[PDB]
Amino acid sequence: SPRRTPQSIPYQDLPHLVNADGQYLFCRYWKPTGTPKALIFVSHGAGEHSGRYEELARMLMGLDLLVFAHDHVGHGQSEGERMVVSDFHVFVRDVLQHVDSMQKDYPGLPVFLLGHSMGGAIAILTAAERPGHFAGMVLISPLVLANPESATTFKVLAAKVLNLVLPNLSLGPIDSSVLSRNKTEVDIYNSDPLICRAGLKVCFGIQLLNAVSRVERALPKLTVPFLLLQGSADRLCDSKGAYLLMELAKSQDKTLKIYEGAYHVLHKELPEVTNSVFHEINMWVSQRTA
Amino acid sequence: SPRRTPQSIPYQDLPHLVNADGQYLFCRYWKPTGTPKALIFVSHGAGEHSGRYEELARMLMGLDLLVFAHDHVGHGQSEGERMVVSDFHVFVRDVLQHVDSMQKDYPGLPVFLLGHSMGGAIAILTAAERPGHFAGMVLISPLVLANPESATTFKVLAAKVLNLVLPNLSLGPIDSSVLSRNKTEVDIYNSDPLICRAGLKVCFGIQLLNAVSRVERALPKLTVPFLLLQGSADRLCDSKGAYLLMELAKSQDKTLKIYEGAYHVLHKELPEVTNSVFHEINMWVSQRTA
Amino acid sequence: SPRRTPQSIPYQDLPHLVNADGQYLFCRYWKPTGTPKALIFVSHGAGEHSGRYEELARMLMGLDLLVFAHDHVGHGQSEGERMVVSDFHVFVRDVLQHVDSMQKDYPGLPVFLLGHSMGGAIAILTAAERPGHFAGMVLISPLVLANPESATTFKVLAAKVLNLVLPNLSLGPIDSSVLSRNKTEVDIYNSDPLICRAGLKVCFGIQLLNAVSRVERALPKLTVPFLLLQGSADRLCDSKGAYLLMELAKSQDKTLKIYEGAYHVLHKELPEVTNSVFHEINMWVSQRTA
Amino acid sequence: SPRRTPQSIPYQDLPHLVNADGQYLFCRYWKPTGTPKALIFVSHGAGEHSGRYEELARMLMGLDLLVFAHDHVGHGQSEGERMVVSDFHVFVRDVLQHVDSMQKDYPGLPVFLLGHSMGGAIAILTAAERPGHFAGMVLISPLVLANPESATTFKVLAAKVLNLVLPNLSLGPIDSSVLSRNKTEVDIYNSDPLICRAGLKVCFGIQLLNAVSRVERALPKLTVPFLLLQGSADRLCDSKGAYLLMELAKSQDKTLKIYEGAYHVLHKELPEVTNSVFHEINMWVSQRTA
Numbered sequence A, B, C, D: 001s002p003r004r005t006p007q008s009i010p011y012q013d014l015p016h017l018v019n020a021d022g023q024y025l026f027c028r029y030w031k032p033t034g035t036p037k038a039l040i041f042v043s044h045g046a047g048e049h050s051g052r053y054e055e056l057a058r059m060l061m062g063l064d065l066l067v068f069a070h071d072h073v074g075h076g077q078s079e080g081e082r083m084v085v086s087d088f089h090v091f092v093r094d095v096l097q098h099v100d101s102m103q104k105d106y107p108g109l110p111v112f113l114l115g116h117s118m119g120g121a122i123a124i125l126t127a128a129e130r131p132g133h134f135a136g137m138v139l140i141s142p143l144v145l146a147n148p149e150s151a152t153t154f155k156v157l158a159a160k161v162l163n164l165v166l167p168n169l170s171l172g173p174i175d176s177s178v179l180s181r182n183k184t185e186v187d188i189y190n191s192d193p194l195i196c197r198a199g200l201k202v203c204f205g206i207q208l209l210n211a212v213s214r215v216e217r218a219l220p221k222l223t224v225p226f227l228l229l230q231g232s233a234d235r236l237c238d239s240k241g242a243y244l245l246m247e248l249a250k251s252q253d254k255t256l257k258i259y260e261g262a263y264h265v266l267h268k269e270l271p272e273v274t275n276s277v278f279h280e281i282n283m284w285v286s287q288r289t290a
């Protein structure tokens, strides 16, 4: 029985890679028509998947960059129990494998990282493990701070307790309306069968917290250049973390753009925001490439 | 500001009633063309709503029965925080008010109860509080026993603990595929904006457990006639409870029909099951009416 | 088999009374040689017992007051599981029974209350239930406030959790050196076989907390006259509660005496403190009696 | 300020050693008058101390064995917070240091281990780490199995929970009457100011559980000869563990003696038991020495 995606598609019929844990990961690529000037890995957030970055990737591809990605373990078309991971570092390790693989085929090319939410945390931790290895990082409402509301020192304590007693315990529920102010995208979001909307599991929320702790420790050694995109009304990733990221990161090349009133999914928000986001990412990456 | 449904429709524009807690409840009616031979209240399950019984109600209406219902508090178009109730008895109290109201307009008419899942528990508790008052009860995979898997003496203990620390804590996630084997209805189920699919809250799961405890105590005094419809593969309401209901209830008029392999939502299952269900309910109620 | 004390002495051989719960309570009396001018019930603290007030009682007896007492349920020579009570109010109820019994034999006589620690809480709650019934109250480092250290909003939450899971769970350990600065009495305290030094049980700590809550609510209606004796270095009953008691109680006749550096057991502290305590209690009660 | 024992005696005035954690441990020695035929380390149980083995040690000394010991960290006259240890292995590590020190001064001499309760677990783990290094082991009601009553899979789970929330949380209370049937020794036990009777702390109970887990894993590789002394009525260390120890240990030289009705502290039990214990230990060790 050939290995198949959680949606029953055989892996031999799709682009993929096998991780250190022997798990198949669904891969995605956007190769420019000619010799690429640089490489860029896209890191998606929790529950979502790599296919959600189709248009963003097509814009980057139009700049002559070889865009690539894969669905994190337990996500999209990749193997593994939905939204669960032995340890958060697995996400980083897998990213490095994919990056290391792509760099071998395209030697001497600069490598950028693009991450959103949990994807942002992964990106930060990826560069933090390889100082001076990446050319730049594009962060869209990255996970850097614990929800001052959804995760207080008390709720974290309780979650840790649940982890010992009811680890497999699934939580919830999160209103998809806090993702974007664009109703179309909210519907689109609820219609995606590759997305996961089954509420954060206990053991996974712990990992998410591990991620934030790790990111905070990493910041004093983060030197990679970055573009930080954040919305003021982000109820998932508080803008407080964005300002803290700008302050605590040691990077010499760091930019912050705030979108007043915007929500979480900046790249899938109101046309006026999405347009600026796409544009800003374009200008930023363009200047850092040649 | 006139009171409006959770979906923003003013209550003065829909049939409704105001409960003892001063909360508006959305009402639904199916009045036969001529003098009704009997009355029948429909009690929906958790998360769902009264509109889901359109066809079942139309069949009953065709038998000359005045069908009526309302969305339980915190459900459908009724007021109240989604899937929460101060105490389970509130559901019963409200049913009695609606029944008491309808009986006043149609004196001397017999009154039946139709309940599914949590709705079944409510029905049982309603008749148990008014012995010899109802003519009959139709139960579709009623809530009578605690999930031997989802709620063991340990998980119940943990839930009770969570109730003290994280009461407002929402849970999850429940796969909608365990509801029916009919894919159309599963999609239909996920498309209903009146239905609630945000995972069982902690404080509410407690109430659900209160319900089961109360039902067990009530059974030794339950004398109302009933038709019990249950599926063998029900992962929400184990068939064990059905057999126990047949054995522990004191009723002199009690019937049990098992649907081999069928799931939870019997009235929305495979055509062959739904057809028999509708038919059996028809024959059963018909014989008890004149 | 005639009922015997927890130490195996038959109750028919000692002064006693039987409470509403059918439990035997060991009684103690100090009757003046002639007609008593007033009655005074002594309420001991947790773990300890009525025999610990021998000398204090003998001084009061020398003032022509009929002193009386009994070991609270689950204490000293009284029946009941060590340091456990269905509800704190039981302590109050039993006090009233004993007071009501003694008043019948000595009609028209004024009635005072003397309480220490938990005994103080009981005294306050006793008078609060019978406004204008008692002539006065003598409070020695009374239980009125929750240990700002041993019981924070978090520890209380945890205790409540333990009450559901591990109610019978016994705690600990409390250093007897925090009771008094007088080493002799500390040794004396550890040598008493009637005293309980087995650490506070979970279910009992809850009751203790109930007591504090009840006392706080009662204070706005407490009108009984009182003498408040408190030590600055009391690590069991923080002096903060004493000042709060002086402020929150409505009594028109309220006095506070602070013993600088003194510990918990004021009546069993350094000679200089104990001497003043005995003296102050003497003067205070004397003026209120005739 | 020279380091002093918890009882204020300077360490320079007593025999001692400094552990790997820089903590002072109170040492005790019983050196025969002439060249010793072997060495024997005594491992005391929880709360107690090395001085409790005075007579046992004097008997062993009379057999020409160099007896030695030290109070485990957080015990007796040794430094460290009462009844707490970073990890159970610390106890083993310290034993090896003391053994390694003594062996250097007395090269080529065989080395025996004597342990009671928690002391027995330490002894087993000490030999398990150094297979074929010790000549023999004398075990008195050793800690090998979790209290089927005081520690069920549920209570262990709860304890682990407490470890995360209330680690410093002290427990209780343990009736000293379950130690021995000899009332004199029970009094003696309660009179010892070097003994600890402040109830088992949460973080420490965890370690105790770690110990049992470790012992069970070690048994399949335990080859050291041993004498196992156990009482049938031991409520602290169930005799079940003794039989399991006899069965699960791989040792070729293993003996078991059961004392019918006897309690925990076999060496401090009824004269008839203590006499046999001392005698049996004498015969057993004598045969294994020359």
Ligand SMILES: *C(=O)N1CCC(CNS(=O)(=O)c2ccc(Cl)cc2)CC1
Residues within 6 Å of the ligand: A044, A045, A046, A116, A117, A118, A119, A143, A145, A146, A147, A150, A151, A159, A200, A204, A205, A206, A208, A209, A212, A236, A237
């Ligand atoms: C982006 O992909 N995300 C998903 C994860 C959320 C919440 N992360 S967190 O605030 O660190 C958190 C972790 C664990 C719990 Cl239980 C609650 C909150 C941020 C946006």
Ligand SMILES: *C(=O)N1CCC(CNS(=O)(=O)c2ccc(Cl)cc2)CC1
Residues within 6 Å of the ligand: B044, B045, B046, B116, B117, B118, B119, B143, B145, B146, B147, B150, B151, B159, B200, B204, B205, B206, B208, B209, B212, B236, B237
């Ligand atoms: C019908 O409407 N339902 C909804 C409720 C389920 C589960 N009820 S239960 O098994 O009693 C339960 C109560 C509380 C918890 Cl946390 C888990 C399970 C039955 C079908």
Ligand SMILES: *C(=O)N1CCC(CNS(=O)(=O)c2ccc(Cl)cc2)CC1
Residues within 6 Å of the ligand: C044, C045, C046, C116, C117, C118, C119, C143, C145, C146, C147, C150, C151, C159, C200, C204, C205, C206, C208, C209, C212, C236, C237
């Ligand atoms: C006087 O008799 N006492 C005994 C009781 C103590 C502690 N009472 S408390 O601070 O309300 C408390 C209750 C429950 C817990 Cl678990 C801890 C502390 C006061 C003096």
Ligand SMILES: *C(=O)N1CCC(CNS(=O)(=O)c2ccc(Cl)cc2)CC1
Residues within 6 Å of the ligand: D044, D045, D046, D116, D117, D118, D119, D143, D145, D146, D147, D150, D151, D159, D200, D204, D205, D206, D208, D209, D212, D236, D237
């Ligand atoms: C000998 O020294 N002892 C002291 C320790 C006891 C109990 N040990 S246990 O049964 O493993 C246990 C560990 C932790 C908890 Cl919370 C309860 C019981 C055996 C004799």
